[PDB]
Enzyme design. Structure first.
Site, PDB file in Angstrom:
ATOM      1  N   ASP A 103       0.834  -1.188   0.000  1.00 16.00           N
ATOM      2  CA  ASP A 103       0.000   0.000   0.000  1.00 16.00           C
ATOM      3  C   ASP A 103       0.877   1.250   0.000  1.00 16.00           C
ATOM      4  O   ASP A 103       1.972   1.246   0.566  1.00 16.00           O
ATOM      5  CB  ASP A 103      -0.928  -0.035   1.219  1.00 16.00           C
ATOM      6  CG  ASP A 103      -2.093   0.922   1.114  1.00 16.00           C
ATOM      7  OD1 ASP A 103      -2.304   1.499   0.024  1.00 16.00           O
ATOM      8  OD2 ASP A 103      -2.813   1.072   2.128  1.00 16.00           O
ATOM      9  N   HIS A 105       2.881   3.922  -9.677  1.00 18.82           N
ATOM     10  CA  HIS A 105       2.882   2.513 -10.046  1.00 18.82           C
ATOM     11  C   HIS A 105       4.239   2.082 -10.614  1.00 18.82           C
ATOM     12  O   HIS A 105       4.759   1.020 -10.260  1.00 18.82           O
ATOM     13  CB  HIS A 105       1.749   2.234 -11.038  1.00 18.82           C
ATOM     14  CG  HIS A 105       0.385   2.430 -10.451  1.00 18.82           C
ATOM     15  ND1 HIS A 105       0.091   2.125  -9.136  1.00 18.82           N
ATOM     16  CD2 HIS A 105      -0.762   2.909 -10.991  1.00 18.82           C
ATOM     17  CE1 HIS A 105      -1.178   2.401  -8.894  1.00 18.82           C
ATOM     18  NE2 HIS A 105      -1.718   2.881 -10.001  1.00 18.82           N
ATOM     19  N   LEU A 162      12.365 -19.651  -5.113  1.00 16.93           N
ATOM     20  CA  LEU A 162      11.291 -18.873  -4.507  1.00 16.93           C
ATOM     21  C   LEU A 162       9.985 -19.110  -5.225  1.00 16.93           C
ATOM     22  O   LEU A 162       9.933 -19.080  -6.464  1.00 16.93           O
ATOM     23  CB  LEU A 162      11.608 -17.385  -4.553  1.00 16.93           C
ATOM     24  CG  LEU A 162      10.566 -16.396  -4.026  1.00 16.93           C
ATOM     25  CD1 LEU A 162      10.577 -16.407  -2.510  1.00 16.93           C
ATOM     26  CD2 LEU A 162      10.870 -15.002  -4.533  1.00 16.93           C
TER      27      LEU A 162
END
Ligand SMILES: CCN(CC)CCOc1ccc(/C(=C(/Cl)c2ccccc2)c2ccccc2)cc1
Lengths: 206, 212
Positions: free
Chosen positions: A10, A27, A103
Site C-alpha cells: 500500500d 505505479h 522462490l
C-alpha cells in the site's frame, strides 16, 4: 527462521502525490519496489513471497527472467472473469515455471481472503452433494487442504506498508499464527532495510 | 452512533502471566488481576456506547461463570459464550445455558466470551452447517457465497468487529477471530492485560476514530 512472507503493498498513490506526480508514476515506482523485494526474498532463503496489490504486460515481460532465476510463479484469486487471452498467458507463465524449486512467488489478483475460503467450501459441498463426503467428516485439516497455498510453508509474516493497520480481506485462513508487521513506509520506498526490519520483528517474537 | 464510531470491540487479553512474574507472584495472582481488568473493561465498554465486546482468554472458566454472571445481569449485560462447548461436561454446559438465558433479554452491552474458541474452528462449524443443508438437498453447492457463509459464523447477528485490541506485546491473531476481522482495525499495545485500564481503552478507541 522466516519461510513465507506476505505483503500488502500500500502507498503507491500517496507516494505519487507526495512527489507531485500523476498516479501512474507511483505505479512505475511500485513495480521497482516489487522487483527489489522479490530479489531480496530469493537472496535470503525465503521459500515463498505472496504479494497483494491494494499486470497485463507486467507478466509477459518479467516471466522469462523469473524462470531463469528458478522462481515458481503463481497467481491466486479469481481469474475466471479475466479475458481469455490474459487467462491463457497467466496459465502459460504458471506452467513454464511450475517445476522450479527456488522462490515461489504468489501474486494475488482479484483475490479476497473470504473468497478464498468460499472456494474451498464450494468444493467440499460438491463432494458432499455426490455422497463422497459426510458433513461431520469436515474439519480444519480438510478445509485447509483446499484454500490457496496449502502446499507451501505456512505464512509466517504479514507486512503491510502504507500506514493502515488492517488485513483488508487479504489472507485470512492462512494468517492465523502469522506475525503481523505494520510500517508507515510507503510501498515504493520500502527497501531491503525495511524488509530486514520486518524479518527481525519476526525473529524477536520467538 | 457514539463519536468514536466503534460498535464492536474484540480483545485478545494477553499478559497475565508476565504481570504476575514481574511481581514475584505465581500465575494465579495474574489471573486474579486479569479478572479485575475484565470487569473494568466491561464497565468501560458499557459506559461508552459500545454494542458488543468480545473477549479471548489467552476449567478456571467455571469459577468465573459462577460469580460474575449476577454482576453482569445487574449491569444489564447480555452474556454469550462462543466456542466449542460440546466438549464440556453436561453440568458446566448447564451453567452456560442458564447464564445465557438469564441475561438474554438485557439491552445493554453484549459480552461475548470466547471459550474453547478458534477462528478456523468457527469457520469450520459454519461450513458443516452448510454441508448439512447440502446433504438434505436444500442447498446447492454453487449457491454458497460469502454472504451465506457469513450468516453461519459466530456473532453474524451483531455489528461487525470494528477494532481488535491485543495487549501483552505480541503482534498476531493466534487463531482468534479470522473471518470476522477482514476489515477490522488491529491495535497492538505492550501493556499487560492486568494493567490495561480505561485510559488504555480510551486510547485504542481514539486511535480507531482517528485512523478511519
Ligand atoms: C472471579 O471473577 C472473574 C474471574 C474470571 C474472569 C474471566 C472471564 Cl473471561 C469471564 C468473564 C465473564 C464471564 C465469564 C468469565 C477471566 C478470564 C481470563 C483471565 C482473567 C479473567 C472474570 C471474572
Amino acid at each position: 527462521g522466516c519461510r513465507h512472507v506476505a505483503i500488502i503493498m500500500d502507498g503507491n498513490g500517496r507516494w505519487a502525490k507526495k512527489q507531485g506526480k500523476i498516479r501512474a508514476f507511483g505505479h512505475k515506482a511500485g513495480a521497482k519496489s516489487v522487483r527489489r523485494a522479490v530479489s531480496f526474498a530469493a537472496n535470503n532463503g525465503i521459500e515463498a513471497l505472496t504479494l497483494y496489490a491494494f499486470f497485463v504486460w507486467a507478466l509477459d515481460s518479467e516471466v522469462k527472467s523469473l524462470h531463469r532465476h528458478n522462481v515458481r510463479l503463481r497467481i491466486i484469486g479469481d481469474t475466471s472473469r479475466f479475458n481469455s487471452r490474459l487467462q491463457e498467458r497467466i496459465r502459460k507463465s504458471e506452467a513454464l515455471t511450475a517445476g522450479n524449486t527456488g522462490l515461489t512467488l504468489n501474486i494475488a489478483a482479484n483475490y479476497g481472503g473470504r473468497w478464498d475460503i468460499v472456494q474451498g467450501v464450494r468444493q467440499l459441498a460438491e463432494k458432499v452433494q455426490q455422497g463422497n463426503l459426510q458433513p461431520d467428516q469436515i474439519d480444519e485439516e480438510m478445509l485447509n487442504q483446499h484454500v490457496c497455498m496449502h502446499e507451501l510453508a505456512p505464512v509466517d509474516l504479514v507486512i503491510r506498508t502504507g500506514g493502515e493497520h488492517r488485513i483488508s480481506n487479504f489472507l485470512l485462513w492462512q494468517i492465523a499464527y502469522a506475525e503481523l508487521y505494520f510500517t508507515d513506509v510507503l510501498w515504493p520506498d520500502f527497501d531491503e532495510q525495511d524488509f530486514e526490519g520486518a524479518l527481525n520483528a519476526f525473529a524477536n517474537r520467538e
